[PDB]
Amino acid sequence: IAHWYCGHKFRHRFMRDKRFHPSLQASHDARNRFSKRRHFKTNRWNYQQAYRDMP
Amino acid sequence: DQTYGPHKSYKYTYMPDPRKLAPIETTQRSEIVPQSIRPPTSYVPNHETFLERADIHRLRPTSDFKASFKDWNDLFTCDKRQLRVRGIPRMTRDAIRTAVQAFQNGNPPERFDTKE
């Protein structure tokens, strides 16, 4: 591992590689991989009545 | 970290090959097509008149080199390398040699002076 890529440590390289790993990729189940925590508890106090046009 | 330089110096023997030193059958190309020199015309009587009528370009100042040739045969006996020995600059000596071989082909150095 060339030392100039990513951080000054080695493990930073493998931490950004986990971003490209095949079986780790973003889909309908696993979402917002890179910032999970900025979006957390965001809608707790947002009250949305669900959509029903059928009785 | 590699400060030490190469591990070995690989060198091969020189051992002369009896097969590569074997006599080579030779021909001289002057035998196949004989060389000759065209005698001067009334148009071009001297080597200096020649260098005068081959002078066209501003940068091919042929006429300035008249002294570096002793006679007629001296001119047509010159080739480019030996023509460099005598200290003629580059594109000038190409103009000269071109002119000479052209005269040899049956085309005399008749061309309009472009300097003006």
């Binding site: - | 008749e110 061309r111 309009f112 002076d113 003006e116």
Partner: protein
């Protein structure tokens, strides 16, 4: 280039080129002669052009239809193989 000799018709002009290509009749005759000689060369040259053209066309016929022979046999074989695999299917 087009050679412009010194005995071509001199144009007296200060606004343009000093020498117009216009020929002494001698120059015209001369030019005609030289050009006849090179005509002699290019006759054989283009003769060889079209000769090689038909050579290449003919070889293309023969090899290409040999190719079509072998190839058609191949694709006939493949097609047979397939409809068989589908009967089995």
């Amino acid at each position: 280039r087009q050679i412009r000799p010194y005995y071509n018709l001199p144009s007296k002009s200060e606004h343009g080129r000093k020498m117009t290509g216009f020929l002494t009749p001698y120059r015209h005759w001369m030019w005609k002669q030289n050009e006849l000689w090179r005509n002699v060369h290019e006759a054989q040259f283009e003769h060889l052009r079209r000769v090689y053209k038909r050579q290449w066309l003919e070889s293309f016929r023969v090899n290409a239809d040999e190719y079509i022979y072998k190839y058609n046999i191949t694709k006939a074989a493949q097609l047979a193989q397939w409809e068989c695999e589908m009967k089995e299917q």
